[PDB]
Amino acid sequence: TGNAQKQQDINHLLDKIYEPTKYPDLKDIAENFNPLGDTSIYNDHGAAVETLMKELNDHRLLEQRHWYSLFNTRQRKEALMLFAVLNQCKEWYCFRSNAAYFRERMNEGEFVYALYVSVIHSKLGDGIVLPPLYQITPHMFTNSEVIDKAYSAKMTQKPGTFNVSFKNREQRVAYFGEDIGMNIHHVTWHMDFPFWWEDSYGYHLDRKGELFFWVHHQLTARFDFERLSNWLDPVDELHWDRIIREGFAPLTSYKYGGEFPVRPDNIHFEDVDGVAHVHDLEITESRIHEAIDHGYITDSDGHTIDIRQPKGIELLGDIIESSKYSSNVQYYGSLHNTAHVMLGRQGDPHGKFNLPPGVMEHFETATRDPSFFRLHKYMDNIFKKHTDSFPPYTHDNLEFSGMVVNGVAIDGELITFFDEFQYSLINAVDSGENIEDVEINARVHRLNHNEFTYKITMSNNNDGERLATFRIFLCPIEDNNGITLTLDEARWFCIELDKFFQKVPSGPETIERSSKDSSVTVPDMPSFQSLKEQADNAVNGGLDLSAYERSCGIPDRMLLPKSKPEGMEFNLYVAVTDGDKDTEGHHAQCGVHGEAYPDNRPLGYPLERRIPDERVIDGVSNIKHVVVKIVHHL
Amino acid sequence: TGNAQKQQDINHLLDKIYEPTKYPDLKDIAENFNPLGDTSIYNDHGAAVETLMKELNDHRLLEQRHWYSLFNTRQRKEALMLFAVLNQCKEWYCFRSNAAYFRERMNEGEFVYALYVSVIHSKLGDGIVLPPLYQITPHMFTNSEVIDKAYSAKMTQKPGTFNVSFKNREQRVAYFGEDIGMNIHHVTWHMDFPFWWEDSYGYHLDRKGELFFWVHHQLTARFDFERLSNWLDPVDELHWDRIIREGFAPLTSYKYGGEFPVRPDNIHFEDVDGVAHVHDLEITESRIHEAIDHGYITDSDGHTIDIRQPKGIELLGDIIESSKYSSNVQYYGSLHNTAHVMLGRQGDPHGKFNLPPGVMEHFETATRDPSFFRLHKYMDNIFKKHTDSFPPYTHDNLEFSGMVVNGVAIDGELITFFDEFQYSLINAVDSGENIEDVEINARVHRLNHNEFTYKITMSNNNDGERLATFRIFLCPIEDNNGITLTLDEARWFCIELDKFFQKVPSGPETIERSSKDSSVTVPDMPSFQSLKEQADNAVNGGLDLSAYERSCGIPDRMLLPKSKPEGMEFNLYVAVTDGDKDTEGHHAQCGVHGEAYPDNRPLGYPLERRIPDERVIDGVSNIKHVVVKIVHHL
Ligand SMILES: [Cu+2]
Numbered sequence A, B: 001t002g003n004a005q006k007q008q009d010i011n012h013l014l015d016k017i018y019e020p021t022k023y024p025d026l027k028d029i030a031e032n033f034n035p036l037g038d039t040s041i042y043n044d045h046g047a048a049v050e051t052l053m054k055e056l057n058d059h060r061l062l063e064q065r066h067w068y069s070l071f072n073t074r075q076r077k078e079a080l081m082l083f084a085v086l087n088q089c090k091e092w093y094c095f096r097s098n099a100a101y102f103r104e105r106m107n108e109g110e111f112v113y114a115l116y117v118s119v120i121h122s123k124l125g126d127g128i129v130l131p132p133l134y135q136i137t138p139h140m141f142t143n144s145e146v147i148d149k150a151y152s153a154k155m156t157q158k159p160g161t162f163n164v165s166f167k168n169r170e171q172r173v174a175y176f177g178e179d180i181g182m183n184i185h186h187v188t189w190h191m192d193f194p195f196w197w198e199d200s201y202g203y204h205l206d207r208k209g210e211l212f213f214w215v216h217h218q219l220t221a222r223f224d225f226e227r228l229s230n231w232l233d234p235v236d237e238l239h240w241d242r243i244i245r246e247g248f249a250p251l252t253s254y255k256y257g258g259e260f261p262v263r264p265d266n267i268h269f270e271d272v273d274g275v276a277h278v279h280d281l282e283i284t285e286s287r288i289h290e291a292i293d294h295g296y297i298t299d300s301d302g303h304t305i306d307i308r309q310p311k312g313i314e315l316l317g318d319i320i321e322s323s324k325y326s327s328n329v330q331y332y333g334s335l336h337n338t339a340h341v342m343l344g345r346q347g348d349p350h351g352k353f354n355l356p357p358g359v360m361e362h363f364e365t366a367t368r369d370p371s372f373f374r375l376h377k378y379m380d381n382i383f384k385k386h387t388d389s390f391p392p393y394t395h396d397n398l399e400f401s402g403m404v405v406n407g408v409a410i411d412g413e414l415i416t417f418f419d420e421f422q423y424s425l426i427n428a429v430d431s432g433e434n435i436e437d438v439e440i441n442a443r444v445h446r447l448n449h450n451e452f453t454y455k456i457t458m459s460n461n462n463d464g465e466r467l468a469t470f471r472i473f474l475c476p477i478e479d480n481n482g483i484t485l486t487l488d489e490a491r492w493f494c495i496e497l498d499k500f501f502q503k504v505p506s507g508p509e510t511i512e513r514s515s516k517d518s519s520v521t522v523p524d525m526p527s528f529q530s531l532k533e534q535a536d537n538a539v540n541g542g543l544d545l546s547a548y549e550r551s552c553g554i555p556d557r558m559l560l561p562k563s564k565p566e567g568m569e570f571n572l573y574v575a576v577t578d579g580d581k582d583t584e585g586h587h588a589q590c591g592v593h594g595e596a597y598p599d600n601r602p603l604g605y606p607l608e609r610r611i612p613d614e615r616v617i618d619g620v621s622n623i624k625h626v627v628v629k630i631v632h633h634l
């Protein structure tokens, strides 16, 4: 073991992935190993192994140097079998071996996918930090131009970094969707808590349901915000009976595959052969919308499982996205997933052209296409229908008697601008042998803000020390019409900025906290070379980069919304609930390994419920709202 | 001079076009020359030169390593200025110089275009054979896959040759449209007789009008035939008020530019910003259709120019395509051309995506897209409306008293199969310096037939030697329903197979002629390396290369249609008209330089007119029809 070992191995595995490995060890392994000759390394007595082999043998596994979408029911199954081996290894000797043996005869997508999920969930992958997808397989995160510029570099053996690109559209709020950080998170989030997880794999992802509800509600919110800042209007909800108003051209290309199919604007949704009928959604949507409206979800037996309770919204998220936690998957089908594949072939439904899958039929690339947000607004208000059926909250309800926020102040400035980043285009260009490596780079333009700190002034009238949950939302104020909405109109529009638990003493305290300590944030990740340089140094000298092991969050750069240059006033919500009942039972942020989500309040507390008369939020001591102002430096 | 010189120079000029020249001579020229210091080499006292310079100087000329469509009113103008210099050179010292000087600071497309047109039309380019576009700029004629396979070859410096590709469509009659020979011809035909020719350039292309009418009538016919052979039905005529039923994905890529924009099926024609309104066509079409119907074309003054005469159909072709021979271009606009650009941006009319031009906005690539033939059927029956207004032909009309065809026979076997061809992908991949040349090749699958000869047996009942025009059409018989049409239904459907003038001696003769001597055919062209090798062998060893210096025709391989394996019976038409009245006045096939078309009969004689009662064709001695049969070897 070690890690600067485990780590090393990983880096080697995912190095120049589109070509047989150049690391000699990996290849004699790749050749001499037999996953079937010491059914003991395996905790299954190698049933997993024996099942991959069988396929690899009848050679009925997807070919190498071919595309792969995680939405392809077979490609998925294959990818997921590698997971299942790697997964029941007792120690490194068995992982390295397989993710070498297979690495060399299994397709790259299945492989990249398999290795990551495996590293993330398997018992055996603690020490490791995974290189950033963007540099491992750059075709999924880089433009088509820069890609070709990189192939030229290589043809000519002349190095250097190319500048990527992005007045005519709404490819004005593009900086958001096309960011390599969001794209990362978006994929990671669904790697952390995959739709395909069976608790057989080892543990149970806790509230994947609410997690699902919430994560998208926030992309959806975060997204709505940016369009605000751009004189753009909140996003249309997608309907199956209407036209797809805003279509786009991605100008993105597959490594092996071709160029992502484009969609024209004002198109009519076609029945796509092999996935499902347009109507098939319409009905699914109905079945869903009836559970919500009845009060119950009905399983396979005709057993009504009640959802007019706290477990409610997850049971709902199980049927909506359609993970395996689904009660009656034969009835409620899979709205979300199908909706993906469904929106993707819109470029070729009967498939007369044999265009590859589309931007939306992939996690590291969906945020790309505009209907992405159109499709999640729709999912969003499916949930809202349920979320909203609860009776508003009472006074006695929000009140954390004693504790009272006196004041809230921002110790700094809220200022956002446009930084510049560089990732490397090397895994993208093929370098054969005895021809050498030319360093080609890609330079992108991403958003950023300035660290700032919070000065939360507040008195614990209670006799002594109480644990407290510091909940901070950033809601909007006006309409982009100039209509000041109402913490009903705006409660749902708010994006979570931070959530943390601090013990409060008996008396006037002044709790301070930084842009940096935010719980919904993750720093940009270490470069690959960086992770190489570092793996290698430990192994030859004698790696606690327990910075980057889990990381569920969004990019720190994305914390605050972009804003206007003129500036705008947002409304800052500081709600301080009672820590002892919250954490009334138990990372725990990235419960990647079965780790029980620590907060018990539902998600978005306490703005997740109808707020009919603001009269109320306003009279609980432990809730306080102060207006902030964000400015954008050009 | 020489030619094995002129030639050499050319080959050098058009080598690895996408990069500054490696031929030292070309560069000191490229540097030291000044197109403005001996205004004497120029027959204009260099007004041309002084106009390019002015642009090159204010640097308002299109950039290098960028795309270019010949449909772009500016790109065209720029391209066409180079033509105008190269054009008024007195000798080689001035051409070489310029097409060196410019070659290095003008864009490649303008440049390639400029050089060819210039070589083709300028007084000074007799000896020369131009390399095949397909190998000069392979991106416009080669797939998107093979192209990438070639970039890989190059990256790794491992040579190869790749096999190109083409059950779900009508990309079953694809072999026709995607052939590198047709594509060549199509562009050449439009280089030979350009729409932009002003007679200031030096001479007058004779019947560009009828030429235009006809050339497209035959692609259109030839095309209809192939679809026959494929259980496919004759092509729909395109309308501006209907859906674009049948769209395609070209899977083709620009060198500098991106991937050609694709079109979804069942699309509605959008008003495309910058080119023209959909309605703008509709009216044009009307104005056109009213000339035809009135009997006259009305010019700018309100002068009615009659067209119910022989000059008729060309005057019509001048206004329809809209060349500069147009009588009232401000009124009849440019249906054909505009229709090209109009159909191309259908992927991006308001241009929100900034997709490059499309397959149809280029001559070496339009035959690609299915609406290509849909758009020419439409143009086709615009002409037919006029062509058909003439009173049928009388008996006394077709009769070449004396001369009488006794019999007609094919002396071979009519057999068409699928050969294999290889062109080179080198100008496509960038090779910088001190990095050496790897030979990469592309292998295509093209149609072919077997030389066969005609055995035309016929007696001269007259008293002593009459000249004769041997006109041979290949008409269809059955419907693809199995209905069997009527040399009215089928007269227009016939493709020209040969046309030649032979002296018929008095009495029983038996003229024989070959597949090879056909007048509507051209052999595949010499390779580039071949043309290099041969150019090069004749500097050093003190070049005829005469077979390919103009070349209007279609590929010999395309002579006969594809057919069925079962075989089908076509109807062979041998009509022998009177040579002395035909050539009653004067290459002359490729009148590229002002050379008066030799035949005087209108075009398609004598099948261009309504044939109401076959009763007639049937009773002129000098017309004879015999059924042939074509078989396809799988
Ligand atoms: Cu997602």
Ligand SMILES: [Cu+2]
Binding pocket: A336, A376
């Ligand atoms: Cu989603």
Ligand SMILES: [Cu+2]
Binding pocket: B186, B190
């Ligand atoms: Cu044409």
Ligand SMILES: [Cu+2]
Binding pocket: B336, B376
């Ligand atoms: Cu045309």
